[PDB]
């Protein structure tokens, strides 16, 4: 309803940025790397997840997976505070390939993919793996239920899938979790990619370039397609599981996504890990097929090494990129906020950026010094009738010492140009 | 910052026996420029693989090595910036750490016909291999 | 819906000479939020009057102008939603219609001592007047 | 950012009569790449002058115009980044401000023999003039 | 004493603070306050800047402010600039250039005044006038004309201007940085001619290096850096001498600086030609004016054109930014400077503490993009600790009025504290 804040192009914004340090634990071991953080906020409660590994920051290469439940609380500070309520380690952490958080009805829900094979997505199938829901609330002990993938229905001949993303969504009794699927046949079309007027590589044709750019980079015979999983149930009973693929309109290689409930709509985000290096996001129109109204963003990108750096546009067999959530601020003005990386090819210099689809409105660096950051996530909410946001950054400020993500809270500026 | 590495058969830094060794400290910048259209029109097309020392000796790659960057366009200045931080925007993580070894090669035939030749190629013929022992 | 108008002396939309003009069509929503407790604790106390253009220029109100909304509490975010329909749940009707002028101001001193000051105040010092030609 | 302007006789953006007009707002970036060694080896040598509208129409420069940038090297991709701020690291200040006009041309013959020829040249033959009315 | 961070580290805490009460605030938004200069000596400073109408060019200025002040402890554990006197130059509308010197706890301003804004391209110094304006906290300013007629020169100079960010007082002698003009090539260039760079097809390196010293607007004139030594008997019997800089490692004429720091005399020369690395050094001999040039491989400056940041090879180039340095430790060869972290644009100022061969540590001034055309830095001992004050020629509000900014900061006591 009410929305009072800066909605114009301006400089020197006052986000009133403050870092929160008491939520995420501090490990005494310097060799442990805490990586790939996830955070989902809903109805004043949050669910935080991160991975802990020994001398390696790879996600499935992790011996511990932390699951935190908490609440948003006013401390009279004129700003929202994170109150950590419960903190547990996942019972199958050393076999976790991926997890996705959902805060439903003021409680935490974690959807994880467990496998004996760290390369399960390249040489195995989902019948060989297991998928779990770990759910809990404040001080209650966590309970983990195995998802009956045998009684699962799919809209196509998928051979594998993993929960991959920064968050899911609760609608009534249904959970909607972002998922990346694997299929071993080329069932896709690429009118959007095939319409680009770019230099033709002398080797292959544009139709082949666009077909092949959807392939997995480690199994030339497999294709990674993004989608969603809809799980409806009768109070953890009589599970009904559905697997729907994303629209084939403006396809991009399988990548971690996100679903968020914001402003009465459902926003889907897909990290750009292929040739289209610009922001992939959109609101959900239909659920079958999963059709997000793709944005036409000409100003938001992400860094990456190789043939697809920041602002790269032309179709190319590319793989790589960073995950950088967005959060909508005003539906009518098409405004969004996101912690993006201000570098063409290196993952560094995070900047809080409030932007249009066509212009960047305002921005501020997170750190004055150069800061390594592999991924960011952002969630915004109403607090004291004012728009506040909390972001988590996968940081590496101490090179060689322990790695730990960072949480920042900031407010959208009420007026333009205040410093 | 460090000295960029022009990747062409006409680059002297590739020692005929020792390759190109660098001793970078953490937090250094390092570009790997693949060459523009050279004056004499000798079109140079390569495909660079992040590889292991064992497969660096044989100069062969299986499918698991990731095609780090490919030198497709002759006119456009294709490049590849590296900062030796831990977190990198590449698929498969590519943790740099310190006191490790990191080997980069290309197995490609000089032109695009053998662009994806993975058996031998420049890694042994011209020994255009970049080896990066961080530290020391 | 329309863009809400934060009612505080710290709002740029109030042009230094022209005030804040709005051209809303019928059936639009428009909130007028009176500010929360600001960070530096500068308590902002106002009393808003639905007024006529003639006394809106002179910035004076007699007893008949109706106190449209008063910003009593500093902590609680008191607000004021407007739909430009004809019927309104307010005393004295307040018919909006179309192609009319509607002026809202405050004659109050910044603090609670001059809360009910009706002679001059912010209407002329800061020209915080909302003028709405529908 | 803006679309960079490659400065060569083989660029369509140079309208045959109007040159290349741009309407940049303050705080915009704008590269002026002078071309690399082209494929067909047609070496392109120019010398660009920041100029005034009157002599941009007449296509003549005296000694007072400052050589803004010269396309010396054929192999190296020489370039020229512009931010339309007021302060610029150039000799003679070169304040940009807003709602002004800024004209950039070259009076040079295509090759190095007339590199410093300031009488006529490309300004009228090909009308390769960059005119930047900021604002509007 | 000398207890501070002397190693490569991240996240330095300079305790940076902006000073706003020193530089006046002009009521006219169209006026541009540009080209600031600041010189600190013995706890007193002299600040100078130019004011112009809808133009930030130095001689295109209708007012030139001259401020004298003092460093004072306010119990803040940091130095504050205390403005004592503030006057406008009596010949502001004719000022081509000025240089500040704080001598004996007083201010001295050495200015070049001319009716012709293009005097350096078509005239000579007999046609122009040169003045010393001097004052302190109590005395009214007095301006004396410099008798250039009674000047002795070490070469056949045809013109000169005081050009630089500051001067130096030694006894009864003033030593002011100056840029001279001469119309014949009397110079040698072993340093430029020794570079092994690609030879441009038009001319050879001896021609390239001879012509790169020419004025860009008078192909017949050459700009050579130097100093002017003015000795006098209490504003009486002036004795003026004009000496050129050493021919070792010549660079095109440009604004310089002389500073009294750490028992030494530091010379700085802005890099406005092809050698884009820091030209600075301590003074060995005075005739010829020989600074022991550094081999700095990490400090440069941005510029558009054929000589951007980190450019080394000789080329007929003109352009650059003025960025003072200040020495911190003589034994460790450490210096501090506010440089611009951009290849071609003048933006993103960064306080940089550096070696001759490595950058030690640095910090951005603003989180947002900031336009900055020139910086000057001066450091001094305060409460037995090293503090520095820098002035930046800023343009943060594009389109509105321009006014420089003053920052004070401390060299970090310990490394890596945030
Ligand atoms: C966010 O995107 C919207 C479009 O979805 C932009 O819309 C329009 O953008 C222009 C340019 O900034 C705004 O200014 C107008 O420019 C024209 C140019 O001729 C000028 O004649 C007008 O008087 C006006 O100044 C325009 O107001 C704006 N309109 C709307 C409805 O958004 C918008 O610019 C973007 N956001 C910002 C802050 O620019
Ligand atoms: C790349 O992905 C493809 C597609 O998933 C892999 O091909 C298929 O892998 C399955 C594994 O379940 C093979 O089927 C099984 O093979 C075992 C071997 O003993 C057999 O016991 C089972 O009854 C079943 O047949 C399947 O044959 C194979 N290909 C095809 C065409 O069906 C492939 O292995 C992956 N390669 C790499 C290098 O990752
Ligand atoms: C300032 O310049 C000097 C040279 O004039 C640099 O000298 C030396 O640089 C090395 C490399 O950073 C320093 O560390 C070395 O580390 C290895 C680690 O085992 C050690 O074995 C070496 O013996 C050496 O200590 C070295 O300390 C330094 N020289 C001295 C006398 O300390 C200097 O590094 C530059 N400044 C900084 C802060 O690096
Ligand atoms: C470029 O710089 C040179 C170096 O100063 C300039 O040389 C001088 O130019 C003037 C006129 O431009 C010459 O005129 C002289 O005027 C006096 C007064 O009538 C007369 O007595 C002399 O016989 C002569 O006619 C002057 O000779 C010449 N050289 C010197 C040493 O003064 C040149 O003018 C500058 N060119 C431009 C276009 O700025
Ligand atoms: C981004 O661009 C696409 C392509 O134009 C938009 O999709 C079209 O949206 C318009 C609405 O303005 C419809 O009339 C068209 O039918 C859509 N395209 C097709 C092929 O049906 C999309 O809406 C744009 N995103 C926005 C406006 O947010
Ligand atoms: C009347 O008041 C309105 C109030 O908004 C003015 O509308 C805006 O005026 C500003 C500055 O004058 C412009 O930047 C905006 O573009 C105007 N709004 C729109 C939608 O364009 C308006 O200018 C005033 N005067 C007139 C003659 O309308
Ligand atoms: C461009 O201008 C140069 C100027 O040097 C021309 O080169 C001269 O052309 C004249 C013809 O009028 C010859 O007599 C000279 O011998 C040439 N060289 C010199 C040094 O003067 C050139 O021909 C012009 N046209 C081009 C380069 O296409
Ligand atoms: C495969 O994974 C399941 C996960 O529950 C585990 O129970 C089983 O022991 C694993 N198989 C082997 C051989 O370890
Ligand atoms: C969550 O809220 C919905 C609201 O109708 C309710 O139906 C459901 O039982 C609640 N609990 C869960 C676990 O979904
Ligand atoms: C749902 O199932 C849980 C299982 O622990 C049970 O405690 C609860 O009573 C059931 N009903 C509701 C409404 O939650
Ligand atoms: C490289 O391999 C291809 C494979 O057929 C061959 O045709 C070519 O001659 C080889 N040499 C090159 C491209 O120089
Ligand atoms: C406003 O009016 C009150 C009425 O009592 C008076 O006390 C006060 O001084 C006036 N001015 C203010 C609050 O600035
Ligand atoms: C000026 O020069 C003359 C002769 O060159 C000399 O005698 C005199 O001492 C100098 N100084 C003054 C102040 O006249
Ligand atoms: C400045 O002080 C020194 C002290 O030795 C003195 O020699 C010199 O004459 C003084 N300058 C004046 C008085 O102008
Ligand atoms: C340039 O010459 C110097 C001295 O002759 C020499 O030390 C240096 O190595 C030369 N440069 C190159 C690139 O060889
Ligand atoms: C000048 O600086 C370079 C930079 O490394 C250095 O190699 C060279 O030895 C220095 N010259 C002298 C005489 O020290």
Author numbering:
A (entry chain B): 207 to 625
B (entry chain D), D (entry chain C): 31 to 166
C (entry chain H): 31 to 164
E (entry chain A): 208 to 625
Quote the study's own text.
Cedar virus (CedV) is a Henipavirus species isolated from the excreta of Pteropus bat colonies in Queensland, Australia. HNV-G proteins comprise a short N-terminal cytosolic region, single-pass transmembrane domain, oligomerization-mediating and fusion-activating stalk region, and C-terminal receptor-binding β-propeller domain. Binding of the HNV-G to cell surface receptors belonging to the ephrin ligand family initiates pH-independent activation of F, triggering a fusion cascade that results in the ultimate merger of viral and cellular membranes. In our integrated structural and functional analysis, we demonstrate that in addition to using the common HNV receptor, ephrin-B2, CedV uses ephrin-B1, a receptor with no precedent of HNV usage.
To this end, we solved the crystal structure of the attachment-mediating β-propeller of CedV-G in complex with the extracellular β-barrel domain of human ephrin-B1, to 4.07-Å resolution. Five complexes populated the crystallographic a.s.u. and displayed no appreciable structural variation, within the limits of the resolution. Comparison with the unliganded structure of CedV-G reveals little overall structural variation (0.4 Å RMSD over 417 equivalent Cα) within the ephrin-B1–bound CedV-G scaffold. CedV-G engages ephrin-B1 with an overall binding mode that is similar to that used by other HNV-G proteins, when recognizing their respective ephrin receptors. CedV-G and ephrin-B1 form a 1:1 complex with an extensive molecular interface that buries a combined surface area of 2,900 Å2 (1,450 Å2 per component). Ephrin-B1 is bound at the top of the molecule and forms an interface that chiefly comprises residues from the structurally conserved β4–6 blades of CedV-G, which contribute ∼70% (∼2,000 Å2) of the total buried surface area. Like the other HNV-G–ephrin complexes, the G–H loop of ephrin-B1 (residues 113–129ephrin−B1) constitutes a major interacting region and is inserted into the central depression on top of CedV-G, contributing 1,700-Å2 buried surface area to the molecular interface. Inspection of the CedV-G–ephrin-B1 complex structure reveals that the side chain of Tyr121−ephrin-B1 is inserted into a large hydrophobic cavity that is unique to CedV-G. Indeed, the equivalent region within NiV-G (Trp504), HeV-G (Trp504), and GhV-G (Trp514) is, in all instances, occluded by a tryptophan side chain that protrudes toward the toroidal axis of the β-propeller, rather than being sequestered in the opposing direction as is the equivalent residue, Tyr525−CedV-G. Thus, it is likely that the expanded hydrophobic cavity of CedV-G is critical to ephrin-B1 recognition as it circumvents steric clashes that would preclude its recognition by other HNV-Gs.
